[PDB]
Each structure stands twice: as structure tokens, then as C-alpha cells.
A paper describes a structure:
Conjugative pili are widespread bacterial appendages that play important roles in horizontal gene transfer, in spread of antibiotic resistance genes, and as sites of phage attachment. The pilus is a polymer of the VirB2 protein (or pilin). The structures of the pED208 and F pilus are very similar, with overall dimensions of 87 Å in diameter and an internal lumen of 28 Å in diameter. Thus, selective binding of PG to pilins occurs in both F and pED208 pili, and thus, the F family of pili are polymers of a selective and stoichiometric protein-PG complex unit.
During the process of helical reconstruction, as the resolution was increased, an additional separate density became clearly visible and readily interpretable as a phospholipid. For the F pilus, it became apparent during the process of helical reconstruction that two populations of filaments were present, differing slightly in the rise between subunits (see below). Instead, two 5.0 Å resolution electron density maps were generated for the two F pilus populations. For pED208, the angle between adjacent subunits is 28.2° and the rise is 12.1 Å, while for the two F pilus structures, the helical parameters were 27.9° with a rise of 13.2 Å and 28.1° with a rise of 12.5 Å, respectively. Superposition of the structures of pED208 and F TraA reveals very similar overall structures (root-mean-squared deviation in Cα positions between pED208 and F [13.2 Å rise] of 1.4 Å and between pED208 and F [12.5 Å rise] of 1.5 Å) with slightly different boundaries for secondary structures. Also, the TraA pilin structures in the two F pilus forms are virtually identical (root-mean-squared deviation in Cα positions of 0.7 Å). Thus, with the structures and helical parameters of the two F pilus forms being so similar, functional differences between them are unlikely to arise but cannot be excluded. The amino acid sequences of both the orthologous pED208 and F pilus TraA pilin are similar, except for the F pilin N terminus, which is 4 amino acids (aa) longer. This longer N terminus could not be traced in the F pilus density maps and thus must be disordered. Indeed, the presence of phospholipid in the F pilus was also confirmed by MS; however, this time a PG species, PG 33:1 (16:0, ΔC17:0), was the major phospholipid observed in the F pilus after PLA2 treatment.
Author numbering:
A (entry chain 2N), B (entry chain 2M), C (entry chain 2L), D (entry chain 2O), E (entry chain 1O), F (entry chain 1N), ...: 6 to 70
């Protein structure tokens, strides 16, 4: 017998490296930086905009099925 | 099956590179600079007015769906 | 569907290039210069009176919706 | 007589070091970090992404049948 | 024989993507944000107002019968 | 059959865009700003006074039944 | 049916544009300025004395029921 | 019903244009000027002695209940 | 036949808009505010003193038999 | 029948506008101000000393049975 | 019945206008001034030494049972 | 009953007008003056050496138990 | 017949205003304050040391049989 | 009958004014001051070293059996 | 019975006036002064080096078992 | 039993009067003087170069284990 | 007859002051401190390492059979 | 009988003074310092790097079986 | 048995003295210095660029497995 | 297994010695010098223009992957 936990894993395709879910955060990332940059006017919050992106890239690349 | 996280993403069009949400901050940006410039009279707070703008541009351009 | 962040943006008209909010700072600008010019008697604080004005102009002109 | 608790242990192969079940968490791991990193923008939540991975590795390696 | 769990599913129409039940939360959403925004005056609670809406949209769209 | 969740929705009229409930927060909004402005004397807390208002406007306008 | 959130709104008359509650802050306003002006001797804290007043005026005028 | 925030407002009479509280600052005003005038020997700190006085006068006169 | 759940509803008069039970909380309200205000010295806890009062008013007014 | 929640309300006289319980807080009020004033040496904590007093006055006056 | 919150109020005599507890702060007052005066050498911290004293006097005099 | 806050007040004798604690500051006073006089060579820092001394004297004399 | 719940009430004498049981807490009170004062070094935990004592006094005095 | 809560109260002698338990905190007191003084280098944490000591003294003296 | 909190108090000898633990801070003391003196170059941080030492001395001498 | 805080105190040898750690600061000392001397060209910053050195010497000599 | 609850009490020797079970916690103690010290980098978690040890010592010494 | 809690204590060898588990933290230690040093640029976080190391050394040395 | 915490420690190779993770900070180090140097234009932030580097070197060299 | 922290490091190419990010600061460098040179007219701010450049060069050259 094979493993029955499988089937679909469209879940991947749902969460896939390019999917709906993934992109959203980046917008939030872009938003929240612009958000928090307003009050502080510190150049801080513009980071994961780079980082998160490449983070998720290798992050997803680690497994991503 | 496709990914079911999708549908609309009018959310994009709601947050889209030219949308309501985006522009607001810029005003705040323009405001808060004029705000904080008053007390300090330092030429500092006039930056992201350029930066944030082009920031969000490429920032949105990074993904923006 | 359209973006639901919209509606009014009388907020613009509230913050609009000629609106209530905008003008106030300029007075403060004019005031605070006269303010700080008193103690220093340095010709410094008479600037953004020009600058801020034209600043906000193009500043608002950048987007201002 | 042998032990009758045995048979299959495809359960292993179902939970096996590389199986369906295992990978899912990592995605969640990658997700939730990106999740919680948004609100805090603290570099914290990017850890078990390394840790959990190698954790489960030796963790599974401890027994994993 | 067919499935006898069926019949009506006016329940859908009762919970349907546009129904009574659905809308209520959004008001609460709009309310509670205005609620909690008062004490904190943090721009936080104005989110699901967007999110929940589009959330339920695709959320309902996932199945919604 | 129709949906039985309905009936009244005077609740709307109770929470309606112009109703009792709505206005209260604005006062609180006006109050709490004057409140917190006292201790800080920062021009911050005078915002949602604009924002919340127009916020609820489109916010209610999003659905508001 | 009408909205049952109503009744009294003497609360208004309690918070009304001229009421007890309103005036208090102004005194505090006048006080705290004189307060903080002592230590700094900066002409700063004499502002909302004008501002807050007219602020609350239009502020209350925005809704104030 | 009337507003129940009222009653006493002896608080006024406690803070009243001529009351205990009011006068104190003026002494401090007179003191701190003499204080800070010593170290600087600049004729500066003798101002609000006039200003604060008339300030509070119209200041209290603005509302003062 | 009429409903036999009735009779007395002195319970109302026992809980009535002006009764024993009602008033107690207000004292507690007044107390607990003074209570918690001591430790924090935050102006917070002086609210429901207004709110609860008018709250119960319309609250009782909603039905109160 | 009358309401049986009544009887005594010596509780009032126990909590009465002049009673034991009431006064205590004021001492604490006077204490804690002197307390917290020590560390900060900010003139802040001397307030409710006035406020709380008159607060409880009208506060008790609101109902106080 | 009388109020049972009473009895002793030696607590007063424990906190009384001349008691143990009261005096301590004044020493701290005298100390902390000498403390903080050292680092700043600003004539500031010698105040409540007068103020606190007379403060507590009338402060206690307000009620002090 | 008497006040139980009492007992010892060797604390006085520990902080007493002539005690250990008192004298220390004076040395610091003498030191820090010599300290800060070095860099400035301004005759300033030789003051509380007189002042603090007599300050603490009457200061302690105010109460000092 | 009399009430048979009685007899002994040495329980009182066991819990009596001066008994074993009573005193223990005070020690704990004294201990736990010294306990929690260590970590915080906040002057807080030295209170019920007064309060609890007089609390139990009138507290016991309320009935204490 | 006597109270049976008694017996030993070596517990006192275990917690007694001079016992093991008592002294420990003082060391911690001495330690934690030296601890927290390091990071701040504020002269603050050297207090209860006096205070706690005499505190516990009268504190224990209050009852201490 | 004796007190059972005792035994060892090698803890003393572990924390004893000359022990491991004690000395460490002094090094830190010496270090942190040299640390913070670098950035400020203020002669400040060379104090507890004397003070802490003699502080702990009498400090330990106060009890130190 | 002996004190178990001991063992190694190679920490000393790690921080020892001649160790790695010690010397570093001196370089920084030499550096920062040359650093800050550049901008001011004041002969000031050449001091602890002597002082710190001999400072740490006796400083370490005070205890240094 | 003797007590039959006895026999073995190798349980002691199993839990004995030096046994397997005892030591484990100390490692955990040492571990968890190093654990929690990482995230906070507060010097806190290095305590029971001393305390627990001597704690269990006298703790076991209290009875330990 | 001997104690049956024993056997293996490879757990030691698993946690042993030189084992896998031990070293990890040190890396984290080295990491987190470099981590937190970035944002603050305070020389603080480089400590337990020494301390934790020698800490665990004697710490493990205390028992470590 | 051997210790089962082992296996991989590719984690080392993942965090190894030359690995991905290590280098990143240095860039940040180089960045943040250039970052913070801009606003201050103080020559400060160019340090750990040397320090952190050699820091991590010996730091990793301390254990690094 | 290899280290999974890797992948991309386009991050380098994103931050690479010649990349977008790098150049920006230099402009700011050139700007801010011209900025701050205006007010002071001191020849100071024209430095890192050289320095930062070559700084980042070797700085990046130190590692830069």
C-alpha cells in the first residue's frame, strides 16, 4: 500500500511558490513597511520586502514538496 | 483541481499599484513631513515623499500579483 | 468587483490641494518663522514659507489622487 | 508467536521522514513565520524553518522505526 | 436512493454569500474596529474590514455548496 | 421558503449609517483625542476624527445591508 | 420598530458642545501649558488653547448628534 | 434628564480665575525668572510674568465655565 | 388561558430602573474607578460612571418589561 | 409586595459620601502622589487629589441611593 | 446598624498627618533632591521639599478622616 | 491601638542629621565641584558645598522626625 | 430547642482575632513582600503589611462571632 | 479545649526575626542591587538594603507571633 | 525542634564576603566603567569601583549571616 | 561542602590583568583619542591612555580574584 | 505489629539525595537557563542553578526519610 | 535492590559537557549577540559568549552526574 | 548507546564559520553602518565591521562544534 | 546533506558590490553633504563621499560572500 495522506497536494499549488496565498504577505509586507515607516520615518521597515521575498524563495525551496 | 485560495484578488485591485489604499499614505507622507518639519525646521522629512513613492512602485512591482 | 476601499475620497477634498487642512500649516509656517525669528533674529526661518508652499504643491501634485 | 501490533507500519511510510505529513508543517512553518513576521517585523519567526527541519531530521532519526 | 441529508439547503440561502447572516459580522467588523481603534488609536483594527470581506468571498467561494 | 434569519434588521436602522450607536464613537474619538493630546501635546490624536468618520462612511457603505 | 439604542442621549447633553465635560480639558489645556511653559519657557504650549477649542468646536460640529 | 457630569464645579472655584491654584504658577513664574536670570543675566526670563498673567486671564476668559 | 409565568414581576420592581439592585453597581462603579485609578493614576476608570448609568438607562429602557 | 432586595442599605451609610471606605482612597491618593512624585519629580501625580475628591462627590451625588 | 467598615482607623493614626509613614517621604524628598542635584547641579530638585510638605499638609487636611 | 508603622526609626538615626548617609553626599559635593571645576575652570561648582550643607540642615530640620 | 450547630466555636478561638492561624498570613505577607520586592525593587509589595493587618482587624471585627 | 492550630511554631523560629530564611533575601537584596546597579549605574538599587532590613524588623515586630 | 530551613548555608560560603560570586561584579564594574568611559570620556563611571566594593563590604556586613 | 560557584575562574585568566579582553580597550582608548582629537584638536582625549591603564591596574588590583 | 507501609524505601535510594532522579533536574536547570538566557540575554535564569541545588539539599535534608 | 531509575544515562552523554546539545546554544549565543548587536550597536550582547560557556562548564561541573 | 541528539549537524555546515547565514549579518553590518553613519556623520558605526568579523571568528572558534 | 540556508543569494546580487541598493547611499552621501554643508559652510561633510565609497569597497570586499 502507498501512503493515503496524499492526494491533491494541490495544497502545494494552493500555497505554491507562486500561488495566491504567497503573494498576499508581500503586499502586506510592502504595506506595513509604508505603514510603520510613516510614524517612525526610520529607514527600517524596508527590509523583508527584500528579505521575506528571498526568504520565502529558499524557504519554499527547502521543501515545497 | 486548482487552488481555491484564489477568486477575486480584486484585493489587488483594491490595493493595486493605483488604488484607493495606496495613495492615502502618500498624503500622510506629505502631511507628516510638513507636520514634523514645522517643529524641527530641519530639512529631513522631505524624503520618502520621493522615496516611499518610488519605493512602493518597485515594491509593488516586485510582486503585486 | 471593484475595489471597496473607495467611496468618498472626499478625504482628498478634505485634504485637497486647496482645502481646510492644507492652509493651516502655512499659517503655522508663517507664525513659527516669525516665532523663531524673534529669538535668533537670524534670517533663516523665512524659507518653507516659500518652500513648504511649493513643496506641498508638487507634493500634492505627485499624487493627490 | 510474534507481536501482532505489527503489520503495515506503512504508517511510518505515511509519516516517514520524507512523506506527505512531514512536509506540511514546514510550509506552515514557512507560512507562519512570514505571517507573524508581518505584524512584528521582528527577526524572530525565521528559525524553526531551520530548526524544525533539522529537528525533525534527527527527531525522526531517533527512532522512525 | 439519493442522499436524504438534502432538502432545503435554503440553509445556504440562509447563510448564502449574500444573505442576512453574512452581512452582520461585517457591521460588527466595522464596529469593533471603530471600537478598539478608540482606545488604542493604533491603525490596526481597520483590516479585516477589507480582509474578512474578501476572506468570506473566496471563503464562501471555496464551497458555498 | 425564504431565509428566516431576516425580519427586523432594524438592527441596521439601530446601527445604521446615521443611528444612535454610530455617532457615539465619534464623540469618544473627539474626546479621546483631546484626552491624549493633553498629556503628549503631540499633534497626533487628531486624525480618525477625520479618518474614522470617512472610514465608517465607506465602511458602512461597503455593506450596511 | 425603531432603534432601541436611543433614549436619553442626554449623553450628548452630558458631553454636549457646551456641557460640563467639555470645558474641563480646556482648563487642563490652560493649566498644562502654563505647567510645561514653566520648565521650558519655550513659547510652544500656548496653542491648543486656541486649537483644541476650535478643534472641539468643528470636532463636535462634525457630528455631535 | 439633565447632564450628570455636573454638580460642584467648585472645581472651577478651585481652579477659578482667582483661586489658590492659579496664583502659584505666577510665583513660580516670578521665581524661575529670577532663577534663570541669575545664571544667564540675560534679560529674557522676565516675560510671562507679564505674558502668563494676561495669558491665563484671557485663557481662563475663553471658557472658565 | 393566560400565561402562568406571570404574577408578581415585582421582580421588575425589585430590579426596576430605580430599585435597590440597580444602584449598587453604580457605587461599585464609582468605587472601582477610584480603586483602579489609584494604582494607575490613568484617567481611564472614570467612564462607565457615565456610561454604565446611561447604559443601564436605555438598557433597561429596551425592555424592562 | 415591596422589593425584598432592600433592608439596611446601611451599605450606603457604610459606603456613604462621608463614611469610612470613602476617605481611605483619598489618603492613598495623597500617598501615591507623594509616592510617584518622588521618583519622577514630575508635577503630575498631584491631580485626582483634587479630581478624585470632587469626582467622588458628584460621582456619589449621581446616585448614592 | 452602623457602618462596619469602621473600627480602628488607627490607620489614620498610622498614616496620620504626623505619623511614621508621612515623614519618611520627606527624608527621601530631601535625599533625592540632594541625589539628583549632584549630577545636574541644577537648582531644580529643591522644591517639593517645600511643596510636598505643604502639599501633604493641605492634602491630608482635605480629608485625613 | 497605636500606629504599627513605627518601631526602630533608627532609620532616622541611620539617615539622621549627623549619620553615615548624610555626610557622603557632601564629599561627593566637594568632589564633583573639584571635578567639574577642572574642565570649566568656572567658579560655579563651589556652591552647594555651602548650599547643600545648610540646605540639608534646615531640610532635615523641617521634619527629620 | 436551641441550635445544635453550636458547641465549641473554639473554632473562633482557633481562628480568633489573636490566634495561631491569623498571624501566619502576616508573616507570609511580610515574607512575600520581601520576596516580590527583590525582583521588582518596586515599592509596591509593602502595603497589606499595613492593610491586611488592619483589614483583618475590622474584618474580624465585622463578625468574629 | 485549646486551639489545635498550635504546636511547634518553630515555624516562627524557622522564620524568626533572626533565622535562616530571613537573612537570605538581604543577600539577594545586596546582590540584586549590585546586579541592577551595574547596567544602569544609577544610584537607585541601594535602598531596601537599608529599607528592607528595617522594614522586616518592624514588619516582623508587628506580629512575629 | 530547630528550624529546618538551615543546613549548609554554604550558600553564604558560596556568596560569602570573599567568594566566587562576589568578585565577578567588581570585574564587570571595572569593565563597564572602562566600557562606558570610552564613549563618553566623562569621568563618571569610575565610582562604584570604589563604592560598590565598600558598599558590598558593609552591605554584606549588615547581615551576611 | 565548598562553594559550587567556583571552578575555572579561568574567567579571571580570560579577563586577567594581562589577558585578551583587557588590552582591547586600551587600543580603543588610543584610537578614540586620536579619533576625537582630530575634530577638536583639543588636547583632551590623551588622558585615560595614562589614566585607564593605571586605572585598570589598581582597579584589577582591588580584587581581580 | 509494625507498619506495613514500609519495606524497600529504596524509593529513597531511588530518589535519594544523591540518586539518579535528583541530578536530572539540575541538568535541566542548567539547560533551561542557557535556554531562556538566549532569547532574553537577561541575567536572570542563572539562579536556581545555585538555588535549586542548595534548595534540594536542605529540602531533602528536611526529611529524606 | 538498586535504584531502577538508572540505566543508560547516556542522557548525560547525550547532554554531556561535550555533546551535541550543549554546543548548539553557544552558536545561538554567538548568533543572537551578532543579531541583537546589529540593531543596537551597543557593546552588550557579547558576554555570555564568554559567560555562558564558562557558566555551563562549572554549571555542568556542579553535577553532570 | 551513543547520544541521539546527533545526526546531521549539517546545522553547523548550515551555520558554519563560512556558510550562508554567517555572511548575511556582515552585509547588514556594512549596511547599517553606512545607514547610521548617514544621519550622524559620526565616525562610529564603522567598527564591528572589523569587530563582528573577528568576533564571530574566535566566537565560532570557541566551539563551532 | 548541504546547508539549506543557501539558494539564491541573489541577495548578494541584490546587495552586490555593484547593485541597486549600494549606490543609493552614495547619492544620499553626496546629497547630505551638500545638505549639511549649506547651513554650516564648513568643509566637513565632503568626506565619506570618498570614505564611504572606498569603505564599502573593502567593506564588501571583506566578505560579500
Amino acid at each position: 500500500q502507498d501512503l493515503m495522506a496524499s492526494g491533491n497536494t494541490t495544497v502545494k499549488a494552493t500555497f505554491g511558490k507562486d500561488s495566491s496565498v504567497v503573494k498576499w504577505v508581500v503586499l502586506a509586507e510592502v504595506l506595513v513597511g509604508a505603514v510603520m515607516y510613516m510614524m517612525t520615518k526610520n529607514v527600517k521597515f524596508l527590509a523583508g520586502f527584500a528579505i521575506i521575498s528571498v526568504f520565502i524563495a529558499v524557504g519554499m525551496a527547502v521543501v515545497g514538496l
